[PDB]
């Protein structure tokens, strides 16, 4: 029952301010949403995995996921930049943070900081 980010619609996309849209095409934003969802699912499948079934690489990820929990993330779904790198071939560059800003505007994610870490909380 892992939480996924819904695709942006025609109406929604036409309604985000022009300067944000910039270079970014409509399929571009939705393609990125697919990849972010892939990372969310990958992370949370590991979290829900029986610990005795974990190999060394999975346990190391599991440990990092636990290190990144806070009281503000309890019962919520989030990823960080390392997850994008771990589970996707998405480049976390300038265009990517521009993309993230459209996602925040369309209320698909928000940010939980602290511990010097930016967490992207789904929804």
Swiss-Prot record:
Changing residue 113 to A: Decreases microtubule binding. The gene is SKA1. Component of the SKA complex, a microtubule plus end-binding complex of the outer kinetochore that stabilizes spindle microtubule-kinetochore attachments, promotes alignment of chromosomes at the mitotic spindle equator (chromosome congression) and assists suppression of the spindle assembly checkpoint. Kinetochores, consisting of a centromere-associated inner segment and a microtubule-contacting outer segment, play a crucial role in chromosome segregation by mediating the physical connection between centromeric DNA and spindle microtubules. Residues 1-123 are annotated as: Binds microtubules and protein phosphatase PP1 subunit PPP1CA. The modification Phosphoserine is found at residue 110. Changing residue 23 to A: Decreases microtubule binding. Belongs to the SKA1 family. This is SKA complex subunit 1. The modification Phosphothreonine is found at residue 25. It is found in: Cytoplasm, Cytoskeleton, Spindle; Chromosome, Centromere, Kinetochore; Cytoplasm, Cytoskeleton, Microtubule organizing center, Centrosome. Component of the SKA complex, composed of SKA1, SKA2 and SKA3. The SKA complex is a homodimer organized around a central W-shaped coiled-coil structure, formed by the interacting domains of SKA1, SKA2, and SKA3, each end of the 'W' is extended further by the C-terminal microtubule-binding domains of SKA1 and SKA3; the complex forms extended structures on microtubules. Interacts (via SXLP motif) with MAPRE1 (via C-terminus); the interaction is direct and stabilizes the kinetochore-microtubule attachment of the SKA1 complex. It comes from the Eukaryota. Phosphorylated by AURKB at Thr-25 and Ser-110 which negatively regulates the association of the SKA complex with kinetochores to allow correction of aberrant kinetochore-microtubule interactions and promote mitotic sister chromatid biorientation.
């Amino acid at each position: 029952s892992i939480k996924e980010m819904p695709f942006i619609t025609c109406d929604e996309f036409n309604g985000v301010p022009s300067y944000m849209k910039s270079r970014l095409t409509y399929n571009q934003i939705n393609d990125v949403i697919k990849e972010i969802n892939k990372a969310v699912i990958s992370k949370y499948k590991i979290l829900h995995q029986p610990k005795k079934s974990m190999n060394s690489v999975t346990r190391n990820l599991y440990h990092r996921f636990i290190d990144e929990e806070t009281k503000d993330t309890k019962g919520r779904y989030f990823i960080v930049e390392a997850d994008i790198k771990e589970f996707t071939t998405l480049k976390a560059d300038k265009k990517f943070h521009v993309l993230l800003n459209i996602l925040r505007h369309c209320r698909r994610l928000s940010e939980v900081r602290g511990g010097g870490l930016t967490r992207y909380v789904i929804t």
